[PDB]
């Protein structure tokens, strides 16, 4: 955990050198040979760079627009291949839609489909 230096009697902590899993994010090779690489649980220091909670993502562009999740990364971030290049974005959970609620209004179906 720590040692006492043998010449100077001071205590030094030993923190094993940064490491982590490496994952490759890719559209199928039937479409593209471009890839993005995720360095899991590391800072964008020792390793078009996007720092996410899941790790340091390199090669994917950070996009402000959300979309449906395609290739999940983690911590709310998903990646995809669009206009093409690899992008990363915060995933959408679906379209926002308020309900026209009131104490005297009811919506009643007038037609239907069989699916």
């Amino acid at each position: 955990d720590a040692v006492r230096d043998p010449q100077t009697l001071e205590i030094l902590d030993i923190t094993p050198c940064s490491f982590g899993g490496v994952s490759v994010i890719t559209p199928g090779t039937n479409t593209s040979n471009q890839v993005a690489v995720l360095y899991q649980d590391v800072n964008c220091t020792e390793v078009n760079v996007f720092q996410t909670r899941a790790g340091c993502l390199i090669g994917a562009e950070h996009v402000n627009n959300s979309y449906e999740c395609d290739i999940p990364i983690g911590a709310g971030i998903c990646a995809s291949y669009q206009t093409q290049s690899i992008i990363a974005y915060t995933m959408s959970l679906g379209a926002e839609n308020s309900v026209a609620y009131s104490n005297n209004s009811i919506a009643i179906p007038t037609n239907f489909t069989i699916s």
Binding site: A100, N103, N104, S105, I106, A107, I108, P109, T110, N111, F112, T113, I114, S115
Partner: protein, 227 residues
């Protein structure tokens, strides 16, 4: 609407064919099972090539080269390693089998409750109001075609929990009270079909001084014109 319904049904079936014939991923749930089993077997076979500390992965090469006092040691290493491999394989197959069994139990449940009957369990037989289902076989599995009723078009109606007639509070036996801005009607909850509010559509309980949001209207009595 029988003709419309039959046409929508027939169309929906055609859509199923178009999807299944073109989208390989459509049956990913069954293909994945096959793939996992193939990997388990490929893994098990590849393990035979490992030495596990032995001079050779080939049993015959140990036997053809060493006398028993030494050959037995090398063989023990292969036996231990290969037994570990079988134990790993079997354990994985048992756990995987439990998953398949659970799936089969669900499939059997659906066959009994969804196909043989009609489900009242929401999203058990697909999204929407379940009508009927039809089974189809598949490699190592079952495919269910769930036929559901889904509301398609809707309108904004004004409503009320009850209607006052002569001071009595009238409630629908079935359906809700609605208003199109000038007239009140009573209609079934899942499909707009306005009816005249009559004593045969509503029932009386309590009065106008109790119900919150009760509105004034009239309730038609089919008997009075007959007398």
């Amino acid at each position: 609407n029988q003709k419309l319904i039959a046409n929508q049904f027939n169309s929906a079936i055609g859509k199923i064919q178009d999807s299944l014939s073109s989208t390989a991923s459509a049956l990913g749930k069954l293909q994945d099972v096959v793939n996992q089993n193939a990997q388990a077997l490929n893994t098990l076979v590849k393990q035979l090539s490992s030495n596990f500390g032995a001079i050779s992965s080939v049993l015959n090469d140990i036997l053809s080269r060493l006398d028993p006092p030494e050959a037995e040691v090398q063989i023990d290493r292969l036996i231990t390693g290969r037994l570990q491999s079988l134990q790993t394989y079997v354990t994985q197959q048992l756990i995987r089998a439990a998953e398949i069994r659970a799936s089969a139990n669900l499939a059997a449940t659906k066959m009994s409750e969804c196909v043989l009957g009609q489900s009242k369990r929401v999203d058990f037989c697909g999204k929407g109001y379940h009508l009927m289902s039809f089974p189809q076989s598949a490699p190592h599995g079952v495919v269910f075609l769930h036929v559901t009723y889904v509301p398609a078009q809707e309108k904004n109606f004004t409503t009320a929990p009850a209607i006052c007639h002569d001071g009595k509070a009238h409630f629908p036996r079935e359906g809700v009270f609605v208003s199109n801005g000038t007239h009140w009607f009573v209609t079934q909850r899942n499909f707009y079909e306005p009816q005249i509010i009559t004593t045969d559509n509503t029932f009386v309980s309590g009065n106008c001084d109790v119900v919150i949001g009760i509105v004034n209207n009239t309730v038609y009595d089919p008997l009075q014109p007959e007398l």
